[model samples]
Structures are given as C-alpha cells and as structure tokens.
Target chain A: MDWGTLQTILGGVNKHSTSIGKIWLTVLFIFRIMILVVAAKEVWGDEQADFVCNTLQPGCKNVCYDHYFPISHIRLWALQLIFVSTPALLVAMHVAYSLWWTYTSSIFFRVIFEAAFMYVFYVMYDGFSMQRLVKCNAWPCPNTVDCFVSRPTEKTVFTVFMIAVSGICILLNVTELCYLLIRY
Target chain B: ILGGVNKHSTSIGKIWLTVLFIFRIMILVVAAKEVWGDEQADFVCNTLQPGCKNVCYDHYFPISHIRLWALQLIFVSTPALLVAMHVAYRRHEEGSLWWTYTSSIFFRVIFEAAFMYVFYVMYDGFSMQRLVKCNAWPCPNTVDCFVSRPTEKTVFTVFMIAVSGICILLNVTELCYLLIRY
Candidate 1:
C-alpha cells in the first residue's frame, strides 16, 4: 500500500530480483546487438544521402537528410550502449559492492555524473533535431529553394518540450543527490 | 550589552532575508516575461520565414504562442530553484543536501540522454540532404551548398563521447562516495 511496497511490487513485476534482473539485463544486451544487426542490413542509401547532402549544401532543404543517416545512427548507438550503459552498470555494481562494504561518497558522484551525461545528451539531441527540421522544411519556410533561410514552426514546440523534459530530469537527479547526502 | 548587539544582528538578518525574498519574486516575474517573449519570437520567426513554416502547435494554424510558454517558464525556473534550495539547506547547516544535489544531477542526465536520442533520430532523417548537397551537380540548379562534412560529424561524435565518458566517471565517483559514506 505504501510507496516502498509499490516499488517492491513493481520490481517484482519487472523481474528485478537478483536472478531475474540478471536475466533481463542479458536479454536487453542481446536485444541491443540485434538492433545493430538489423540496422546494418537495412539498405542505408537514405542514410548515405542524409550525410552527404548536408555537407554539400548548408541549408538546401527544410529538412536536411544528409546529416541524419549513418552518422546519427552511429552516434546514437554508441552513446546509448556505451556511455549510458556503463554508468548504469556501475550503479548496479556499486549497489552490490555496498551490500558488503560501507557506503562511500563516490556513489553520489557516480550518480551525479550519469545525470550530467544525460543532460548533455539531451541538448545534443535537441540541437540535432532543430538542425534537421531547419534543413527539411518541416518548420516555417519560404520555398524549397529558400528553405535554408526560413525557420520552422515546430522548432519552438520541440525546444520547449526538450527544455521541460531536461529540467524535470535535472530536478530528479538533484533529488537523488539530496538522498545520497542524507544517507551519507 | 552583548545580548542587545546580538538582537540587532538578528534584526539585520531579517531585513536581508526580506529583501532576498522580494528579489526572488522579481526574478520569477522577469523569467515569465522572458519565456513569453521567446515563444512570440519563435512564432514570428517561423511565420515570416520563406521556406520554413510554423509547426509549433501540431503544425496547426492559429498557433497560440502563449499556449506553449508555461513549460518553458517552468524549465527556466527549475534550475534556479534547485540551486537556491541547495544553498538554503546548506546555510541552515543541513548535512543531507547532497542527496538533493545528486538527485538533481541524475534527472538532468536522464533528460539530456533522452534529448540526445531525439537528436540522433533527427540527424538520421536529415542525412539524406547532406548527401545530395555534397554532389557537385546536386539536383541540377538547386543551389545546394555543403554546410557540414564527414569530418565534422566525426568530431561531434567524439565530443559527445567525451561528454558521456565524463558523466560516467562522475557517476562512478559519486556512487563510490555514497557507498562509503552511507
């Protein structure tokens, strides 16, 4: 009925218990690999176009397709799997380590660092999306030829959403930091 | 005599606190105005642009710029509030403020991560233009000019990686500290 009980129930549903958690993690890891494999097979001609076209013209279209392809794909996969995953893994490790050893100040730093990374990732994502819309004519535009010079209407909405989400996440991270300090 | 002086000091503190409270309210008002102005600017810019169109309200016409301002206002104010809360707690000689700080950082990191994922999707979608623009005779007389290159993409990717790495390190260190301390 209480919050702790809810968390416990949710954890159980998600199979987050020791053995189940490990199994879920392994499945996730495999799923990530499968995604990459499928992505690799999908004829990336469009992606190639997205990358090559952007370099050729500064603002050719309302939505530039060149910049979005292989480059973005590689970027996303690498960050999500490598950087994001590493910290998450570390958190798990720290939890395990702390079960035997006393809590350390370093755990708080680790969590904070992961939160910071997420923030940076959010900015990069928003900026990238804006740039794409600017090139694609998804936002405001004069014409196909003049799309480069025009602004899109969706830009503001997207920006606001990104900012709001980022802010909320930052607040959550700060709350965690407070908890860490309290427990410390 | 010392007691009287101490009482005076307390009075001075109260005045300073009142002044700060007023200043905070003023800041909030200004932030609200700034958010409104920003939304208006986005609307105007999108409307006036030649090729680009306003897509703020589900790409609908009669877009109410003010409708989207509230979220931005909250976004702008939250960071400052978090920082202020941290300072207030510390000033009051609280030892558990670290939890708040860490939690803030965690939320921020998650938010950024999500944003980055969005950017990645957008970039992937746009890569088509990049390729077309690069060709010497791209689309006949379309006037396509290359703005970015593969090298730039590589560099940006590296930068993002570096940032992610730093965040990971910070998370690890913080977790270690928490474990030892708690």
Candidate 2:
C-alpha cells in the first residue's frame, strides 16, 4: 500500500453492481424492509381489541378478557418508526436534498429530538414501568381501577423494542455514512 | 459515538459498562427468588411444616415480574453485547454485510436497550409507594411472613438502583467528555 490501495477497499464497502454485489445489496436492502414490517405490524395489529367471554360462567368463576393499550398513542410509535426510517433511506440513497438551505446538521438533531418527545409520550402514556398520574385520570377520575391504562409489560416491551430500533437507527446511519464515504 | 472514544486516555466507556455489567450479575442472583405472595398470602397461610409456606420459594414469582424481566434482559443481553463489541471492534462493520450488520447493530441496540431497561429498574427502586413501603417482610408471628428477606431485598435493590444510576451519570459524563474533546 498506497492511498490508492486504501481507497479501493473503502470504496468497495457498499458496491453492489456485480451479481455478488447485487446479492449484497439485496441483503443490505433488507434493513429498511425489516423496520417497515415491524412498523406495519405495530400499525395494523394495534387497532383492534376484541374480548370474548365463553358461556358466561355457568358453574365456576370465570374471568377472561382483553384490553388493548391506548390505540392512538400506540399509533404514535408507528409514526415514530416511519420518521426514524426516513433518514436512513435518504442516507443510503445518499440524497443531496436538505431542508432549510443545507441545515443538514440540524435535521438529525431535530429527528432525535422528535424521537425523544415520542419516547416521553410513550412512557408517560404506556411505555414506562411505573404508573403515571395521567393514566389514572382515564374514563373520568375515581373509577375503581383505570381501564384506559395498559398492562405494564405491554408498554415496557414496546419501549424496549423502540429503544433497540433507535440504537439500530444510529448504527445504520453510521454504517451508511461509512459506506457512502468509502464508495464515493 | 460509543466506540469512537480514543482508547488511549479515558477508559470511561468500559468503566460504566463494568458497573452496569456487575450490577446485572448481582441482579440475576437476586432474581432467583421473590416474595411468594403479598399481604394476602400471610392471611391465607396455615402454620405447618415449612411454615413459611406463605413465603414460597420457587425459582420464579409473579409479583417480581418487572424485576425479573429487568434482570433477565441484562443477563441474557450482556454477553451478546460483549460478543457484538468483540466482532465490531475486531473486523469493523465492513467485515461481512451480515456479520457486520448483525454484530454492530445488535451491539448498539443491546447496550442502549439494556441501559434503558436498567434505567427503569433503578427508577422502580426510586418510584412508587410499593418500593418505598414494607411490601416484603420476614415478619414476626403477628406481622407476616414474606420471603427469603424483604429488608435484604430492599437493601440489595437500593444498592442496584444507586449503582445503575451511577452508571448513567458516568455514561453521560463520558458523552460530555467526548463531546468537548471532539
């Protein structure tokens, strides 16, 4: 080596023009789809809540039902996923488009901030392990137990998933950055 | 951002990670058992053989679900994290598309999620009337029978919370350090 030697390796990181490269691209292409699939699941699977009680408990005591966590706030997660998905796609495609006259540095900060707000809502509404007061004010106050509140694990699990996704987002951006820089 | 830190000077990245790592190990040991039941269990108990029958000792307990999950996440994910770190740092993300992607993304995801999860676990230590109150006990004949140790649980849980909280503070400090240095 020379700089030319180093350049060849760096530039090859995301090259997918060949058959092997195309397969790699196909492999690489799976990332965004993976995220959107999760998004679609969250968006679609979240909407319906159906509780069925069989036989109405003729002999023994029977308690069986389902409670869906607040659907709209849950929907916020899907939107969050979509927005989170945005920057990576653009970066992977290496888009030159920038809002606010090349205020590129700030778009990321705003996106991260948006995610933070999304996290605050999610935790306050549903994601947190502990209870929030607003959750208790549901269906009017002084109700024996709050029906609007989600199961602790439901939100906790969702939060963990989103947290992973956030981390993954950071990874992809970093990866994409290196890929583009090297390739170009 | 995490790995970008220069290994020459501040070893801070590994430092908090150690605290977080050690705390999780302690947490798993603590997770082995929890109070068999709450106050109602005491009322329902019959004083017989294994008189702490009210305070059952299975490998699992329902009441400690959140705590169980937190520890479990840490226990299960930490090694994977270590592996991810090893793979990422060793070959870099340019290694193989799959190997590189899986390792680096998983490494980042695991650490971040573990940090957040541990954050809640510690917050649990701080939050709620339950954590504050004497929910678990090794009570007198009159008071109640709780579990292997309630006060012990409190002591350990608080220790974990404090340490985990310390890790967060330390982590943020490193972030600041990197911020200024870069």
Candidate 3:
C-alpha cells in the first residue's frame, strides 16, 4: 500500500526482470498509484457538495443524484486501483515461495494483466460519460428539472488523465509480457 | 500451442478444451434458443406509439445478451485454432517453440478475460433492474419499461461469467503444469 514497502518488495523481485519490467513497476507505483491516492482524491472532493439541481422536492434530489451517478467516481477509481495493484504483490509472493521453493510468471501475469486492463476499460466506460446538463423526470420531480454535474469539464479531464495513465500501464504490461515470453 | 503435443501433455487442458467446446455448443444451441426466444415479441412497452417500443427496447437492451455471447464464443474459441495454424504453417521453422506455446496460452487467457469484460461493460455489471426508465426518441416522456425473464437472464449471465472464470483458471493451471514438467 505504502510506496516505501512496495518499492522494497519490488526491489528484490525486479532483479531478474528486463528493463521493460522495471519500467512497468515504476509506472504502476509512481504514476498510477501516486495520482490515484493524492491528486485524484482532491479533484473529486467537491463532487457531492457542488452538484446542483433546480428542485427542492423531498425525494427528487436523491433520485436525480442516483440517476446521474450510479457509482461514485472516487470509489470506483479506488476499486480499480486496488484490483490493478493486486498483481504486483504476486511478484513478491512468488519470490517468497521460490525462496522457500518465466513460463509460469508470464502466464500468470498475462491473466492478471488482462484482468487489470479490462478493469481500466470498465472504469473508463462507467465514469467517462459526463453530461453537463441532465434531465430528471423520474419519480417526484413535477417535470424535467435540469441537473448540472459540478465541474463537468474538470471531472472529464481527470477521467481522461487517469485513462491515459492506465493506457500507459497497459502498454507497459504488454511490453513486459512480451519481453518475458520472448526472453524465455 | 497444444497442436504439437499429445493429449496427455495436459490433463486439465484436455478437460478444459472439452468444456470450452461443449460450452460453446450449449450456448449456441440450447441457451441461445431458450433464452433469446420471443425477445422481440415479449418486449412490451407501456406506450402504443409506432416507434416507442422498438426505441425503448433498444434503449433497455442495446445488444441482445445472446448475440453478445455468440460473439464471445467465437472469439474465445479462435485462439485454440491459432495453435493448430501455428503448428501447421511453421512446421519447418525453428526454435520458436516457447513463443508458439506461450503465445497460444497468452491469447487464450487474454481473450477469455476480454469477452467477460465485454459482457460486464455491455450489461453494466450484470445486475438487472426489473424496471428501467426509457426516455429515448419517440417516447414523449420517460416511460417505465421492463424486460421479460430478468431473473432467468441474470442467472444465465452469471453462469456464463462463472464458466469463463473457470476456463481462465484452468488455462493458467495447465500452463503451470506445462512449464514445471517440461
């Protein structure tokens, strides 16, 4: 979870890794994890407080909010970060087991890489769609009330930023995977 | 690739191939027929507008689950064919054994995960809401719409997900068994 501990574990594990593998570890820890924890959280801090809807009806706000956001971006990104980071820990565990005890690593890493890559796609699919103005006429609203998502452009930029970082991660993962397979 | 080897090379690989092919057939023949039958007729909307039902239907279910699964079945199975093709065309080629075998496993593993991810993206996390709000074109307002067989469809989706997960696990295991033994 902490970068120091993570770096320490990966320090030992990366001894046999190719240069591409080292870059993959660097991007995963430095860019992806660091941004997700530090800046991304701050950017999404005002998502709840600044959301504005032109309705004061009892249940309308809740309904409109739910409609606009089925899942919160911050929480979803957190889930994505955790799931994506799980595979790196596999390296440490594999190292430990071998101490106790690439085809295997490559295959396993392929599985983990694909899953992580798919999850980034999932995060992008779910959260990247940001409508500045939304019409809500579902339940308690008398008519369609125009709802404005706060900082739509800002959120979109952050989403795009994270996606770009994730894109780099996927490329690095693929490159590492290919390096592992080819070097074998 | 398993193309150059005997069936005894991987016991679970053999079992996985059987399961994969059989699951493919079952999905096409049985599940597709039973689940996707009457989807058009059973799609009912509250409005009688000329284009509301069709629009609403598309809104509710963008791509039919069966059709998506069919696409998934084809792509997931094609990697196995790659193994055969790699062996046949490159018989005289040399020293690419690791690439052939490992790449086959690589493609298979990635394909399985990709399709499952497609399913998740298409269906929005596999949870079905009995009622959906449809406000697309031709519908004057947001009309409450419902899809038939929500429970059955959800169960089938989850079943497909489980089988795909199993296939991934089995492939990884067989890959391990291969490297360790060889």
Q: Which structure among the candidates has the greatest DockQ?
A: 1
- Spell out the clash pairs found in candidate 2: none
DockQ values per model: 0.05, 0.03, 0.01
Ranked by DockQ, the better of candidates 1 and 2 is 1
> Candidates' lDDT values, in order?
0.37, 0.40, 0.62
Deviation in Å, model 1, residue B103 alpha carbon? 1.5
Deviation of model 1 at B30, angstroms: 29
Clash tally for model 3:
1
- For model 3, how does the per-residue alpha-carbon lDDT over A123-170 read when each residue is reduced to its tens digit? 655556565567789898877886655545545656776667666666
- Residue B21's lDDT in candidate 2: 55
Question: Worst lDDT window (10 residues) for model 2 chain B?
Answer: B130-139
TM-score of model 3 (first chain only): 0.76
Which runs of model 2 end up more than 4 angstroms from their true locations? A1-184, B1-12, B30-153, B173-182
Looking at candidate 1 chain A, the ten consecutive residues that score lowest on lDDT are A38-47
